Design a protein around this ligand. Structure first.
Ligand SMILES: [Cl-]
Ligand SMILES: [Cl-]
Ligand SMILES: [Cl-]
Ligand SMILES: [Cl-]
Lengths: 217, 263, 246, 110, 246, 52, 182, 50
């Protein structure tokens, strides 16, 4: 006795985090297959979590003056919060995940003319500076800047928090508060430029995103 | 079926006891990149309903940071929970309280809070229980206590009055003596001495009067000139390893969960 | 010459009932200090020892109706995602019908794991429709009414065809949180940003409107059971969870 | 337990074998007891099988203490219908003993 | 540096006499803390150590007469089935003659096993008759007067021909109960449905009327001893059982 | 291709002299199993044709 | 050293939180050494061996319980009549004692928190949820104030199961405070 | 015949917090007297001890 083929009523399909249960189903139709460009139309690595999220972006940028007294805070930044912003690509990933854990890499640079002298200190402080001794900032993952010497510093850290991840849409407390203060008054000779601009670069490392969400705030 | 019964479809176990552990551990992924077949089922069918639920791709949870599994009844109820409390007014008097699972008997004249809740999660109980009682107030007060099994003579329940029992009788059932000055607390084990196979909380009137009781405790004071402070007693119970729990019931609805509100 | 001296340490005659090691009796009323064997005689062999026993038994947490009058993308029911949830209730006998899942977890400060929502439809082989179940990761209090059905497809979710040989769709909500465990804040007076009980809210949308002839109901009711898998609770406490009036 | 709802009817019931009395158990948690669920669109029958569960080593017929089992059947989802359909469905309950252990012949009747 | 610290646990200086482990002395008056060997010198080797010793010695629990005037099927004596039973008594010296079986079990809350009723007839090689002993399973209070002899044959029972070379019929009443053990309610004020002391009642019927000539008594007395086998009692207590005035 | 479990419509149950034919069936639920008294509550032969 | 308080009326209770917060200044906060120590690093987690000394009174029955962050508990740093079901209290694991028989209690506090760890250096918001190990509550009874006064002193000691992650710059001296007494 | 006698030494119920040997708790609030494993999850492996 020959059995004659009849469609398969019930079935379950989906992809990533979307599932469908269908009761009066049928099979899926497909045509052709994936083709690989024998001649690539673009040579850059195809977009990936790392491509778009684990790269560098310019966070903030300020000035350092001869008028700035010792320990003057030239910058106080919620590194994380700053990245979360349309201005940078990484947003596209954050904007749609509720929480995420990660490490960070900070690069701070300046351009003092050898006729200038003095220095700054850059520290990655978790949460808040609280009442920590300004003079002991070196304890935190830091980078020291001295005109006569270097014009750049780089710090790299992992996830350090009280919670298992940061909540973007509505945070509890900033993961990192990067502080930049005058470590030695910036003096100069009569005629030299009385300032030097400064920038801050940041990027995530080992970016673990979690829970796709439609929210925005 | 040995009972002379027959069937064409099967009969699987429904709602099986102690199915999984209570602490995050690995007894890869838990489900993923395959096809979540456990996302659909016909709950009315006992077999199908056991099909493991799975809707999206997840990873293995990992390891909990704490040693013991807080969901093991033995360990949880191992924390002696609250039972009752009373206070003496005159000298040479006694109090006798029963240990009754009855969901009916509302506190203070009945099982309260946690203990009330717990003993209604299942139908049958049996096995010893480690009672521990704290003394509050007074001092240099001689006292005695004895465990009386269901179905025997014993001073009227939930009532402070002058004992109506031969000192002989009391001591005979196994008793203990103590003095507030030297201690202030007593931890002794209550035996599974009952003519029943087990006891239960959920019952109806009649049985609810005989088969809902482990037993009874009686505390009698002495040398308590009320020119002194007050004398309070608080009792707590903790389940033992020799305790057994058979057949899971539907938990008591919230409206029936009562607590002896005090401080 | 008898010489066994010991020093009396702190916490003299102190009592602690936090765990069994100190709660267990130090003497017994039992004659000869005997003990007892096991005995399932009248217990049918169903010996219990772990609360999992209950937490894995789908119990009824809520009922909601799906009307034809409900248009596409209309939010039909919204539920917070935490074991403590349940809204069922009967007038007389007057009672607040807690679920198994709930009745257990209510006695713990913390919890974590995959909550499982089971949706049972009660239609007739003549209705036809689809409902979209959507989990929005977050906390127990996030305004969500401002979410197009379309918008919801961004969050993890599932659609279900009602008309069928099957009756229940199972929604296994993956543990997604910024914290290792959530807490039973349902005991506190008010709420504090960060002290959350749930990991987000679940939403029921109307995917395809409910079609049908005219000799069958103008709607279709749905039961929502709740149970959990890979469940973990710790830090004992006492509290009788009330009803979550949605 | 069986019934006969016409496919034009919809809704369901739940049948539970509860030992002794329902006491104040949460109606919504009846699934915990050995149960059977009925859904019109699906099944019209359910079967539950249990062993002896009691506080005593046996039941006394002539003059019982408390019922061994109280089978409860409640509406799990209101039974609605379209205008014209039969507004009801009768229901029956079948029972039988298993592993029947009788003890002590007696002339009594009550 | 002497360092042996211990914490003072709960129940400080508490006394417990429930079992020997805590009842036994903690020091002795005996010189050099010596001990004693055994010595059956004047004890004829009859060393006792178990109450079974008594509970298995048929003692006299009751005497009843069997008269010719008693017609077929007439109930002659009714007895509850529990160790605690006994009705014998002497006027002066004034005393209530408890049985061995009883005197032991009276000091326990629970009991279970096969009670043994021994019926000793005191006839003459010239009488002739039969008595039917019938055990009606139940509790210590069941109206039984409404039972034809015929009706009684349904329950387990035994018949005995009195006229003979033998003198005693032994009735080994099998442990039949809905509970693993029965309780000593004979201490309570009143009675409660379910709290029973016996497993049923025993009945003495007239199977065949007592025949005889005329130069011998118009009746025949009967002694009823009581003892138990496979006996088990537990949960010590104190109570001097009174007489069961049938 | 993965086949997904769907209940078994028709079925036949019963015991001794009672049979049932069900068309919109499902499986039977059972809990625990037969327990033997480690301590018998009664020592007489369990009721049987011969007994009674 | 951690803190110290004194009861004035009978049947009352005190509830103090264990908060690393550099903000909360004593007596309503971490003092001396403990204050200093917990600000040397960013994250803490793990059990703690609390030990408390009783001063004064006698024949006073007392009780104490550990309440985890995020749950009901009588208002902090305040002596008042408890507003909690005896049931609830005991349920979280508690202990009872009497001044006559002891005068001191050494019990271990568990790492029961929904957080991965806690911290002292924070800002307002988080400084209200993620800066607390948990809370302790002590309730007296039978203390006719015709008697002496009742004082309580608490001290904390770190356990081997305690962990310390990421070193911070120590608190500047001006922020190191001590509850000056005797 | 239960016979375990010990003499009550000096410094009865005295408390000393000078070192851990005497400062450590003598009982615990933790259920079942459990303990905790390590966990550098959000601590980036930077475990401090000296
Ligand atoms: Cl004194
Ligand atoms: Cl009185
Ligand atoms: Cl003293
Ligand atoms: Cl107040």
């Amino acid at each position: 006795e020959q059995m004659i083929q009849s469609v398969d009523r019930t079935a379950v399909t989906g992809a990533s985090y979307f599932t469908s249960v269908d009761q009066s189903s049928v099979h899926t139709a497909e045509v052709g297959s994936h083709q690989i460009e024998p001649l690539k139309t673009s040579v850059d690595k195809p977009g990936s979590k790392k491509t778009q999220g684990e790269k560098f972006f310019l966070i903030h940028s300020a000035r350092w003056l001869t008028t700035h007294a010792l320990f003057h805070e030239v910058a106080k930044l919620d590194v994380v919060k700053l990245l979360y912003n349309e201005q940078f690509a990484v947003q596209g990933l954050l904007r749609y995940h509720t929480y995420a854990r990660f490490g960070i890499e900070i690069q701070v640079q300046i351009n003092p003319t050898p006729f200038q002298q003095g220095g700054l200190i850059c520290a990655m402080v978790p949460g808040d500076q609280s009442y920590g001794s300004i003079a002991s900032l070196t304890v935190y993952p830091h980078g020291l800047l001295n005109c006569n010497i270097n014009n750049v510093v780089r710090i790299k850290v992992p996830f350090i928090y009280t919670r298992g991840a940061y909540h973007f849409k509505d945070p509890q407390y900033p993961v990192w508060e990067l502080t930049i203060r005058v470590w030695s008054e910036l003096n100069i000779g009569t005629g030299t430029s009385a300032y030097t601009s400064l920038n801050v670069l940041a990027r995530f490392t080992d970016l673990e995103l979690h829970g796709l969400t439609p929210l925005s705030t | 079926d040995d009972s002379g019964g027959f069937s064409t479809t099967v009969s699987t176990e429904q709602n099986v006891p102690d199915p999984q552990v209570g602490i995050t551990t690995m007894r890869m992924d838990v489900s993923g990149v395959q096809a979540p077949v456990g996302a659909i089922t016909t709950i009315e069918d006992p077999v199908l309903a056991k099909k493991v639920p799975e809707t999206f791709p997840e990873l293995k949870p990992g390891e909990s940071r704490h040693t013991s599994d807080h969901m093991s009844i033995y360990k949880f109820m191992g924390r002696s929970h609250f039972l009752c409390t009373f206070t003496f007014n005159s000298n040479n008097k006694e109090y006798t309280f029963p240990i009754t699972l009855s969901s009916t008997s509302n506190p203070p004249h009945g099982l309260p809070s946690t203990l009330r809740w717990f003993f209604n999660l299942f139908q049958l109980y049996r096995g010893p229980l480690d009672l521990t009682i704290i003394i509050t107030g007074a001092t240099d007060v001689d006292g005695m206590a004895w465990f009386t099994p269901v179905g025997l003579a014993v001073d009227t329940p939930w009532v402070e009055k002058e004992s109506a029992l031969q000192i002989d009788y009391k001591t005979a059932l196994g008793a203990v003596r103590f003095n507030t000055r030297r201690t202030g607390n007593i931890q002794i084990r209550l035996p599974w001495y009952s003519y029943l196979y087990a006891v239960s909380g959920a019952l109806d009137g009649l049985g609810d009067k005989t088969d809902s009781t482990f037993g009874l405790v009686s505390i009698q004071i002495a040398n308590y000139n009320h020119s002194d402070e007050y004398l309070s007693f608080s009792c707590y119970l903790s389940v033992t390893e020799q305790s057994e729990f058979y057949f899971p019931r539907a938990p008591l609805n919230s409206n029936a969960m009562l607590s002896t509100e005090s401080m | 010459m008898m010489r066994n001296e010991t020093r009396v340490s702190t916490t003299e005659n102190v009592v602690n009932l936090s765990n069994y090691e100190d709660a267990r009796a130090k003497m017994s009323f039992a004659l000869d200090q005997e003990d007892w064997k096991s005995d399932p005689s009248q217990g049918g062999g169903i010996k219990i020892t772990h609360f999992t026993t209950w937490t894995s038994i789908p119990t009824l947490a809520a009922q909601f109706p799906f009307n034809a009058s409900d248009s596409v993308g209309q939010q039909i029911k919204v539920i917070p995602v935490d074991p403590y949830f349940f809204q069922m209730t009967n007038t007389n006998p007057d009672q607040k019908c807690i679920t198994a899942l709930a009745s257990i977890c209510q006695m713990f400060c913390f919890w974590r794991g995959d909550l499982v929502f089971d949706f049972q439809v009660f239609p007739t082989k003549y209705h036809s429709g689809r409902l979209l179940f959507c989990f929005v990761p977050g906390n127990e209090l996030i305004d969500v009414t401002g979410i197009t059905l379309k918008q919801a497809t961004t969050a993890p979710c599932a659609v279900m065809d009602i008309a069928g040989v099957q009756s229940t769709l199972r929604f296994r909500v993956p543990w997604i949180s910024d914290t290792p465990y959530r807490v039973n804040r349902y005991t506190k007076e008010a709420h504090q940003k960060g002290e959350y009980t749930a990991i987000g809210k679940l939403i029921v949308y109307c995917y395809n409107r409910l079609t049908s002839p005219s000799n069958v109901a103008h709607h279709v009711r749905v039961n929502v059971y709740l149970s959990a898998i890979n469940l973990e609770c710790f830090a004992p406490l006492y509290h009788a969870m009330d009803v979550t009036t949605q």
